[PDB]
From a paper:
SALMs, also known as leucine-rich and fibronectin III domain-containing proteins, are a family of newly characterized SAMs that belong to the type I transmembrane proteins. Members of the SALM family are predominantly expressed in the central nervous system (CNS) and known for their engagement in neurite outgrowth, synapse formation, and synapse maturation. LAR-RPTPs are type I transmembrane proteins and share a common domain architecture of an ectodomain containing up to three immunoglobulin-like (Ig) domains and up to nine fibronectin III (Fn) repeats, followed by a transmembrane domain and tandem intracellular phosphatase domains.
For the [name]/[name]δ complex crystal, the asymmetric unit contained one dimeric complex, in a 2:2 stoichiometry, where a central [name] dimer bridges two monomeric [name]δ molecules together. The complex has three dimensions of ~120 Å × 100 Å × 75 Å. In each [name]δ-bound [name] protomer, the Ig domain keeps its long axis perpendicular to the platform; the two Ig domains in the [name]δ-bound [name] dimer are in parallel with each other and no contacts are observed between them. The C termini of the two [name]δ-bound [name] Ig domains are at a distance of 78 Å, supposedly ushering the Fn domain of [name] to a proper position on the cell membrane. In the 1:1 complex of [name]/[name]δ, the Ig2–Ig3 domains of [name]δ adopt a U-shaped configuration to half wrap the [name] Ig domain, with one end of its Ig2 domain docking to the junction of [name] LRR and Ig domain. A total of 2540 Å2 SASA is buried in the [name]/[name]δ interface that can be divided into three principal regions, sequentially named site I, II, and III along the primary structure of [name]. [name] P212, C246, L249, and W250 form hydrophobic contacts with [name]δ L134, V136, and Y215, which constitutes the hydrophobic core of site I. The [name]/[name]δ recognition chemistry in this site features electrostatic complementarity with [name] being positively charged and [name]δ negatively charged. Since K309/R311 and E365, respectively, inhabit Site II and Site III of [name]/[name]δ interface, these data suggested that the two sites are both vital to [name]/[name]δ interaction. In conclusion, we have determined the crystal structure of a 2:2 [name]/[name]δ heterotetramer that yields insights into how a [name] dimer induces cis-dimerization of [name]δ for their function in presynaptic differentiation.
Author numbering:
A (entry chain D), D (entry chain E): 21 to 311
B (entry chain A), C (entry chain B): 14 to 374
Write the structure that this text describes.
């Protein structure tokens, strides 16, 4: 009926030794175009070459892992063929080894990690990259390019390289990969898994002081015990501070109760008891005045 | 090369297989006998009292294939004692007193398919100690004191079938250890210190799960049961597997302490988002001086602390800056280029949380 | 005292015997369960992963008799954790990671007929560690790193049946150890570092020697076969015994190296008389000053150096003088009373040889 | 026929807690006198009380090991009885414990050790003791008093407490004990075994120099090697000395060969090479003269 047409074509790519590369080729036509990937004049076959069809059926994705230099250096060919037509596209893959990496090549400063999100909540897969020039961040889920398009939809990429998925579905879980690209080449971050679990709702109570810090009056030279207790869900960490000076280290942070025992302070200052939880921070004042 | 067939005085040598055999087993030797025909394919020294392996002992043996030192007193092996055997496929050092694996130990071995160190006292292994042998089909470290092993050399063995770490002190397994490693049947982590386990396709194939009327085999055997598992979302992928119950038990968090790992429902495995405990609100120091920035965040698991320069991406260990494990930031030479608003970010599998510090110079 | 019968959640408790049993064996516990009925006579924690014995765990158990911690990971036991059990007759700690026996460990035990430490990593035992249990019938130290044990406490247990030191590093056994010992069936020294063995009537009754047509039972069982025996007249008494051949081997002297102990004829067991190698011919120093006298003698075995004051029987560590191991003599405060001819004497099992040094002050 | 008579009678003795004591009683008569040992009016019986008859048959020896205070404190009675007579002797045993020991009580400074002697050679069992007053040394072999009498015979006690047995028989071997006695009491040394073995005769060669030290002339500042080799049966230790200064420590003494390699000595001295054996010592002179 209608000969095929290229809706999307690959681009020249450059990668490291042991990295990966992806060429996206999708086409339209009636009949559905048959996508072929060729190295020289023959269809690609090897243990490291993996073709991934699109869920649309419009095309596939050629993924090469890992990258072997100079075995994989060559020109590659996408072929969209059907009953009434055959059409082709070419792209060039160059792979340089680990000591051939120039400065400014995309490097992933912070890669994504394991992330577990409840269903219909917001999951954020972090990424950070640098290089000269500043690299562009793209995402791949299950060897397929993530669609970050600003067209109204769920998946949105942030100002930082981090990817954000609101209202997480079950099909959102999989293997995510961060991809930094610039004029110097293309670099993939280490893969990270996103686990989607069923929603469990539980009453979340912000911190409130069960026992607020009690104003105490002791003449200089003495020692007093100030009881400061806080409650909530989650139960907040309790910490004492004189001004900006933390009076307990982060190693031991009593969750239930924190009492402040002062040593022979003959001058006057205002002490602050703090209760910290993921639901926000509350702080109350205890006034010790020396006469 | 053509010579007579010499035998140790106290041993029995057999020509019966085309491989020359020298059987010294259970002869009460205090040391490796001086006279052994260098053409020996199979040498059994096992169940003797030898405390020391000198270089002279195993020197200039070309055709040796099996060498069994098992059940000896050996506390020491001279470097390059095994340099000579290019054809050795199996070395049994098991049930000995070795407290260390030196880098020159096994530095002549290549074609070795079995290295059996099990039931030794080893507290440490040199970083390059395993670099010489990448061909090992089997590596048995069982029953030792090891806190960790040179993993990057372990993943460099692609022929590895079974790795037995069981009954050791091992802290943790790196995430990318088994990534490109294949052909691996078995891994035994039992009776170790592991809090968590990294995901991996092999561990996805450790489970047996199938619909009724269909049978799914197990291509990978994995036993972690002996560890003080810290049970949170990080182990959720493991809890979702369908496996036998080996009676592994959760040590932490305190809510799950004592509970069997497979008895706990998936929803009860819980990790908690980061919460920033401490910060330095504002800081003033001049140029070219020692600076320190405090950011400490808590959570389950303990979150990863990273920094953000003003209107910038990420700091790191570098020429102009240094980052630490406990979260402190040291800019050794401060500059007016660094004046601005720094962002502290703490990441967790559950989520991330940020605060801000301000710096004027 | 009358109460219900409580059982640990993960264990199985049996009232079948009038002795209350609590069986936690192979339950995968990482720690001693907090709830155990204090009336338990028989408690099996064996084949579990416990790494720590807290004081609270075994506290206020009156009727406990058998306690098996075998095949655990325990690296530490809180002092007086066992203070509470006065009725404990058997304690199995075997197959654990303990590197030390503290003095407060087993400092509550009394009526104990079995202490099984075998297959641990212990490198040391406190001098008073065994002082609390003198009632031990069986002490099993097998498969450890021990160089020596508190022998003077070992000879204070007169009920000791079997002492298993086998597969250790033990240097030597003191001579007067086993004189006070009686009712002792078995001693296993195998796979140790002993050079020699002290004579003893028990070791005289270890042999089986009889005329043809007569069978001799061995009242005492003794295995030293795993040791680097230094073979000289000091072992002659042992060579004259008629015993089975366990393939013990002489490490030294070099002439006997590698020879089987029982193959060597008695006449070939040779110790050599002392020979004085070095001396200080004449010495002049004034009164009240540091003085030193050198006498060094060789031989097989190494001779014992003693000194003789001018016209006097002998010296000792004392207020006026001090003697050392290497043979040097230090008179801290010299006096005209010490002016004269000193005699140095070196004694050996073969003989003795003397030389003379002269001192003027 | 003839009523009995006491040829030797015991004496009052004092000992420590854990030590031993011996009471020697022997008699003559026709019939041979029956020797009995009594505690109070009854024959002694206990696990620690052991009577030892004499090879002569004249009498026995009462040996108490170990000493239990105050269980063994009492008067004891030797009784020589036969057909026509019964006669008696008494002696007192007092035993004081380890903290009751007064200063000057006999103490064994050096006790006997294991000694292996060839048959028909001289064996010497060493002993040393001190106290106030100076204690007297007596010997016990196999729980029997050793006869040291100057009457012509084999066994002779020396000026030192050491016992000496010339021309050692096979019956000489056994358990020997040194006994120090004075006004303060009696103390036994730790028992020691004498092993009598068959005579093996070997040719004994005194040391002679196989290579004597060679006189060497080297101008100052140089370094020379002097070869000194000695031979014999036994092979003598070889040691170098400058004057009275030993140039090799006793730890490493080469048996076969010793060479002296001199370092930058610009002055002149005479060097001595020494070979030492149980067969005596030989020393030769190597001359180094600096010009
Ligand atoms: C701090 O303490 C002083 C005296 O102790 C008091 O005058 C002042 O009001 C306190 N601060 C505040 C904010 O009330
Ligand atoms: C190997 O060593 C032995 C003894 O050390 C020697 O006899 C032999 O010649 C050596 N072989 C070679 C090829 O050098
Ligand atoms: C960065 O430095 C810290 C200490 O300054 C060190 O612990 C860490 O391993 C370093 N990391 C890298 C990637 O260099
Ligand atoms: C952080 O680590 C540095 C060294 O790495 C140390 O000097 C500093 O005291 C530590 N601070 C905290 C709060 O742990
Ligand atoms: C034993 O200790 C427990 C708790 O430590 C206590 O409840 C109990 O009363 C104690 N029993 C005795 C007899 O002291
Ligand atoms: C004599 O000295 C040695 C070492 O100088 C020491 O080991 C020994 O205990 C001393 N003797 C006494 C009785 O203290
Ligand atoms: C001998 O031992 C003493 C102490 O025991 C020491 O001070 C001295 O240096 C030693 N001398 C030698 C030659 O070993
Ligand atoms: C010592 O050396 C000197 C000069 O070399 C020589 O005259 C003298 O005779 C030597 N001593 C002896 C005892 O020969
Ligand atoms: Ca040959
Ligand atoms: Ca090397
Ligand atoms: Ca194989
Ligand atoms: Ca190293
Ligand atoms: Ca453990
Ligand atoms: Ca935030
Ligand atoms: Ca009860
Ligand atoms: Ca105590
Ligand atoms: Ca019993
Ligand atoms: Ca101690
Ligand atoms: Ca040994
Ligand atoms: Ca002499
Ligand atoms: Cl058509
Ligand atoms: Cl390939
Ligand atoms: Cl909610
Ligand atoms: Cl075997
Ligand atoms: Cl050796
Ligand atoms: Cl062993
Ligand atoms: Cl069992
Ligand atoms: Cl614990
Ligand atoms: Cl274990
Ligand atoms: Cl008559
Ligand atoms: Cl009694
Ligand atoms: Cl002779
Ligand atoms: Na062994
Ligand atoms: Na275990």
């Amino acid at each position: 009926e209608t000969p095929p047409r290229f809706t999307r074509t690959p681009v020249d790519q450059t990668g490291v030794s042991g990295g990966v590369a992806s060429f996206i080729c999708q086409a339209t036509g009636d009949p559905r175009p048959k996508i072929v990937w060729n190295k020289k004049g023959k269809k690609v076959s090897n243990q490291r070459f993996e073709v991934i069809e699109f869920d649309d059926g419009s095309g596939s994705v050629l993924r090469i892992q890992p990258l072997r230099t100079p075995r994989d250096e060559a020109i590659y060919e996408c072929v969209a063929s059907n009953n009434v037509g055959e059409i082709s596209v070419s792209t060039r893959l160059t792979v340089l080894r680990e000591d051939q990496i120039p400065r400014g090549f995309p490097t992933i400063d912070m890669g994504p990690q394991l992330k577990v999100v409840e269903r219909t909540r917001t999951a954020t897969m972090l990424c950070a990259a640098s290089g000269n020039p500043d690299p562009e961040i793209t995402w791949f889920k299950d060897f397929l390019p993530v669609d970050t398009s600003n067209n109204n939809g769920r998946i949105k990429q942030l100002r930082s390289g981090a990817l954000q998925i609101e209202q997480s579905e079950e099909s959102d879980q999989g293997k995510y990969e961060c991809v930094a690209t610039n004029s110097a080449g293309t670099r993939y971050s280490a893969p990270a898994n996103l686990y989607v679990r069923e929603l469990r709702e539980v009453r979340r109570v912000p911190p409130r002081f069960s026992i607020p810090p009690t104003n105490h009056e002791i003449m200089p030279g003495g020692s007093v015990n100030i009881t400061c207790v806080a409650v909530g869900s989650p139960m907040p960490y309790v910490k004492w501070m004189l001004g900006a000076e933390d009076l307990t280290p982060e190693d031991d942070m009593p969750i239930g109760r924190n009492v402040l025992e002062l040593n022979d302070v003959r001058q006057s200052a205002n002490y602050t008891c703090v209760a910290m939880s993921t639901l926000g921070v509350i702080e109350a004042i205890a006034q010790i005045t020396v006469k | 090369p053509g010579d007579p067939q010499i035998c140790p005085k106290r041993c029995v040598c057999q020509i019966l297989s085309p491989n020359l055999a020298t059987l010294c087993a259970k002869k009460g030797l205090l040391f490796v006998p001086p006279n052994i025909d260098r053409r020996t394919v199979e040498l059994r020294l096992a169940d003797n009292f030898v405390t020391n392996i000198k270089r002279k002992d195993f020197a200039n043996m070309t055709s040796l294939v099996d060498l069994t030192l098992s059940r000896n007193t050996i506390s020491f092996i001279t470097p390059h004692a095994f340099a000579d055997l290019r054809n050795l496929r199996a070395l049994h050092l098991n049930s000995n007193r070795l407290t260390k694996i030196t880098n020159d130990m096994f530095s002549g071995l290549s074609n070795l398919h079995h290295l059996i160190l099990n039931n030794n006292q080893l507290t440490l292994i040199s970083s390059t100690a395993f670099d010489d042998v990448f061909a090992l089909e089997e590596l048995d470290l069982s029953y030792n004191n090891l806190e960790t092993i040179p993993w990057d050399a372990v993943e460099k063995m692609v022929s590895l079938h079974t790795l037995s770490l069981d009954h050791n002190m091992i802290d943790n397994i790196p995430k990318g250890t088994f990534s490109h490693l294949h052909k691996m049947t078995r891994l035994d982590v039992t009776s170790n210190k592991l809090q968590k386990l990294p995901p991996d396709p092999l561990f996805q194939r450790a489970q047996v799960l199938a619909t009724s009327g269909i049978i799914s085999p197990s291509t990978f055997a994995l036993s972690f049961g002996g560890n003080p598992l810290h049970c949170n979302c990080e182990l959720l992928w493991l809890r979702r597997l369908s496996r036998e119950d080996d009676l592994e038990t959760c040590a932490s968090p305190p809510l799950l302490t004592g509970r069997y790992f497979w008895s706990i429902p998936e929803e009860e495995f819980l990790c908690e988002p980061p919460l920033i405990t401490r910060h330095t609100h504002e800081m003033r120091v001049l140029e070219g001086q020692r600076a320190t920035l405090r950011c400490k965040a808590r959570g389950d698991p303990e979150p990863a602390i990273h920094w953000i320069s003003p209107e910038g991406k990420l700091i790191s260990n570098a020429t102009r800056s240094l980052v630490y494990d406990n979260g402190t930031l040291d800019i050794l030479i401060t500059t007016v280029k660094d004046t601005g608003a720094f962002t502290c970010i703490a990441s967790n599998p559950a989520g991330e949380a940020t605060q801000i510090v301000d710096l004027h110079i």
